[PDB]
Enzyme design. Sequence first.
Site, mmCIF file in Angstrom:
data_model
loop_
_atom_site.group_PDB
_atom_site.id
_atom_site.type_symbol
_atom_site.label_atom_id
_atom_site.label_comp_id
_atom_site.label_asym_id
_atom_site.label_seq_id
_atom_site.Cartn_x
_atom_site.Cartn_y
_atom_site.Cartn_z
ATOM 1 N N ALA A 44 -24.636 75.169 -35.894
ATOM 2 C CA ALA A 44 -25.203 74.267 -36.908
ATOM 3 C C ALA A 44 -24.343 73.027 -37.021
ATOM 4 O O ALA A 44 -24.864 71.970 -37.395
ATOM 5 C CB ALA A 44 -25.254 74.959 -38.262
ATOM 6 N N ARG A 71 -16.531 79.888 -42.145
ATOM 7 C CA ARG A 71 -17.054 81.182 -42.565
ATOM 8 C C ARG A 71 -16.067 82.066 -43.324
ATOM 9 O O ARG A 71 -14.847 81.783 -43.413
ATOM 10 C CB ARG A 71 -17.671 81.924 -41.344
ATOM 11 C CG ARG A 71 -18.836 81.195 -40.704
ATOM 12 C CD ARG A 71 -19.816 82.137 -40.070
ATOM 13 N NE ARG A 71 -20.941 81.536 -39.315
ATOM 14 C CZ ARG A 71 -21.088 81.607 -38.014
ATOM 15 N NH1 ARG A 71 -20.140 82.075 -37.227
ATOM 16 N NH2 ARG A 71 -22.198 81.109 -37.461
ATOM 17 N N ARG A 108 -28.378 72.834 -30.077
ATOM 18 C CA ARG A 108 -26.960 72.594 -30.181
ATOM 19 C C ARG A 108 -26.109 73.623 -29.412
ATOM 20 O O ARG A 108 -25.025 73.254 -28.892
ATOM 21 C CB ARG A 108 -26.519 72.466 -31.636
ATOM 22 C CG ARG A 108 -26.997 71.146 -32.288
ATOM 23 C CD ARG A 108 -26.637 70.991 -33.749
ATOM 24 N NE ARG A 108 -27.244 69.735 -34.210
ATOM 25 C CZ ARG A 108 -27.389 69.376 -35.490
ATOM 26 N NH1 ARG A 108 -26.887 70.124 -36.489
ATOM 27 N NH2 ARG A 108 -28.008 68.231 -35.780
ATOM 28 N N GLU A 115 -12.700 79.672 -37.228
ATOM 29 C CA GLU A 115 -12.921 80.953 -36.588
ATOM 30 C C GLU A 115 -12.216 80.866 -35.232
ATOM 31 O O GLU A 115 -12.402 79.907 -34.469
ATOM 32 C CB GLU A 115 -14.431 81.129 -36.307
ATOM 33 C CG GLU A 115 -15.189 81.951 -37.274
ATOM 34 C CD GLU A 115 -16.667 82.138 -36.932
ATOM 35 O OE1 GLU A 115 -17.355 82.652 -37.779
ATOM 36 O OE2 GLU A 115 -17.120 81.634 -35.885
ATOM 37 N N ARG A 173 -23.345 72.266 -26.710
ATOM 38 C CA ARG A 173 -21.937 72.667 -26.687
ATOM 39 C C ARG A 173 -21.541 73.322 -25.366
ATOM 40 O O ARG A 173 -20.397 73.130 -24.874
ATOM 41 C CB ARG A 173 -21.612 73.566 -27.894
ATOM 42 C CG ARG A 173 -20.307 74.353 -27.797
ATOM 43 C CD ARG A 173 -19.014 73.485 -27.709
ATOM 44 N NE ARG A 173 -17.842 74.335 -27.632
ATOM 45 C CZ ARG A 173 -17.412 74.965 -26.539
ATOM 46 N NH1 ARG A 173 -18.020 74.766 -25.388
ATOM 47 N NH2 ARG A 173 -16.375 75.771 -26.564
ATOM 48 N N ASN A 189 -25.386 78.647 -39.597
ATOM 49 C CA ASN A 189 -25.816 79.366 -38.387
ATOM 50 C C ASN A 189 -24.987 78.925 -37.152
ATOM 51 O O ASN A 189 -24.239 77.967 -37.160
ATOM 52 C CB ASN A 189 -27.311 79.133 -38.146
ATOM 53 C CG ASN A 189 -28.016 80.292 -37.461
ATOM 54 O OD1 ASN A 189 -27.372 81.212 -36.937
ATOM 55 N ND2 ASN A 189 -29.350 80.240 -37.466
ATOM 56 N N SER A 218 -17.808 73.296 -36.969
ATOM 57 C CA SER A 218 -16.554 72.789 -36.371
ATOM 58 C C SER A 218 -16.571 71.270 -36.349
ATOM 59 O O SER A 218 -15.529 70.629 -36.618
ATOM 60 C CB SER A 218 -16.338 73.326 -34.977
ATOM 61 O OG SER A 218 -16.057 74.710 -35.036
ATOM 62 N N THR A 219 -17.726 70.693 -36.089
ATOM 63 C CA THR A 219 -17.888 69.234 -36.132
ATOM 64 C C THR A 219 -17.578 68.683 -37.518
ATOM 65 O O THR A 219 -16.902 67.642 -37.678
ATOM 66 C CB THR A 219 -19.295 68.837 -35.650
ATOM 67 O OG1 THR A 219 -19.514 69.266 -34.278
ATOM 68 C CG2 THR A 219 -19.563 67.356 -35.619
#
Lengths: 229, 229
Positions: A13, A97, A157, A34, A161, A10, A16-17
């Site tokens: 979520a 993704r 989150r 992405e 960000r 999601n 990227s981390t």
Amino acid sequence: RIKKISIEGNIAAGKSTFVNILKQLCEDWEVVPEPVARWCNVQSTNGGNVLQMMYEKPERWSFTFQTYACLSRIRAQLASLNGKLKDAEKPVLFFERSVYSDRYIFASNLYESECMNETEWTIYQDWHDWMNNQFGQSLELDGIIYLQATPETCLHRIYLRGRNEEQGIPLEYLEKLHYKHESWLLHRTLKTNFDYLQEVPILTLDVNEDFKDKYESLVEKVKEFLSTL
Amino acid sequence: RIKKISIEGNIAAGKSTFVNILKQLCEDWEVVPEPVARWCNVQSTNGGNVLQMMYEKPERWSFTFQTYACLSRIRAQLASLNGKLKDAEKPVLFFERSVYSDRYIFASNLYESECMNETEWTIYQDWHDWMNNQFGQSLELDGIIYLQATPETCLHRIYLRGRNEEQGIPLEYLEKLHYKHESWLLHRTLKTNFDYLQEVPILTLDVNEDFKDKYESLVEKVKEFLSTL
Ligand SMILES: Nc1ncnc2c1ncn2[C@@H]1O[C@H](COP(=O)(O)OP(=O)(O)O)[C@@H](O)[C@H]1O
Ligand SMILES: Nc1ncnc2c1ncn2[C@@H]1O[C@H](COP(=O)(O)OP(=O)(O)O)[C@@H](O)[C@H]1O
Ligand SMILES: Nc1ccn([C@@H]2O[C@H](CO)[C@@H](O)[C@@H]2O)c(=O)n1
Ligand SMILES: Nc1ccn([C@@H]2O[C@H](CO)[C@@H](O)[C@@H]2O)c(=O)n1
Ligand SMILES: [Mg+2]
Ligand SMILES: [Mg+2]
């Protein structure tokens, strides 16, 4: 020769981390993020922010966004496959993704929410089918890593960000997206047009806890999973 | 091996009428019509009429239509090239319009008329460039036949044909389209991103008079033109 793994999750979520610690684990591993910053400033390969346009007026801009995002993804994923990773000894490409979540999670939810009409939805699926017939083979997945987090964790989150375009997203929308992920990747009851996906191996990782604390155990599970593929 | 000729002209100039006499002149000649009936009933490869949607609200639907029409054209043109015409002795494929008029005549005019915004226009051009890099080679033209008719003649011919979706088109719109055709194909002053087009041979045929009377002379000029290519 290149193994392809999609990282699914999601909004906020932690894809990227998680992506940002992978290359340090093995020299033959590559990532395709992405291109979210590019969706915020549309320029030919100062411009319009098509991500913001969709969230400001989704019944106007969903079809345009959904088509552009998926094409941009395919182009980026093909660029990585056809590059220098092709030369490595044990190459693994991780995608933030897939074309499958573009259609079966994001675009489907927007159609179901009356943000695409029947015409838009028919054109999108027709386009998606054609793009996959021309390219689906080279992008076929060997595995999926599902980063599972509650929609409430995700909402927090987004705040952490601070990406401007996402600050207005309501919990209701994240919840709809969550149940679609659970159907696809946990219960495996979401039907698609790509039969191989029902048998593709899935590693589910609960990422509700702080990354700092969970990192070592996550890495162990990933290395184990990849050794079975 | 297949020679490719685009038939260009304004709305109702008589492209389909001209196309309908070509196959009888030579067994090795094939035609690719614009799939206009399909644009009026959108179905995956009762549905929405995307042609009607564009004309009813062009600032809403131009980008969607322009992207769908051009993809549908490319798919049809590729299907014809890769079929049994490939086997003939002296194969010639005639297209009812090209990807070049889709962009430089129709989509450009709609952008100029504020029916696409800057974001839409950037996405469309980016998409068109990419589609042509992937396929432009196999569809490259050997010649253009320009069926030249006044915009007033065209307005009368919309009435004669009676296609429901076109009955509301104003002369002003046909006039804008006419001057774009004249710039591209008569004065050859319209700049594009496809350098070879500035030298492609063009046969201009005045089709303002009744087809019944002009047919023999038109056929003579076409056969002569094709013998130079
Ligand atoms: N497991 C975690 N623990 C603490 N913070 C996290 C965790 N995962 C992500 N974050 C934070 O949440 C925000 C979103 O993470 P990000 O990786 O951008 O998500 P995504 O790529 O899935 O949209 C960032 O501020 C990031 O630092
Ligand atoms: N040169 C001509 N003389 C008389 N009628 C014509 C001529 N060219 C076209 N027509 C008529 O004009 C209408 C539009 O022709 P059509 O071939 O459908 O145009 P297009 O394919 O260019 O949109 C039809 O009713 C057709 O019979
Ligand atoms: N097919 C897709 C893919 C992504 N997105 C959106 O892009 C942002 C960054 O992941 C997020 O706000 C959200 O996931 C989308 O709406 N549709
Ligand atoms: N790129 C394109 C191509 C075609 N068209 C429209 O389609 C109909 C049939 O030629 C006509 O009403 C008109 O030419 C369009 O608007 N844009
Ligand atoms: Mg991310
Ligand atoms: Mg026609």
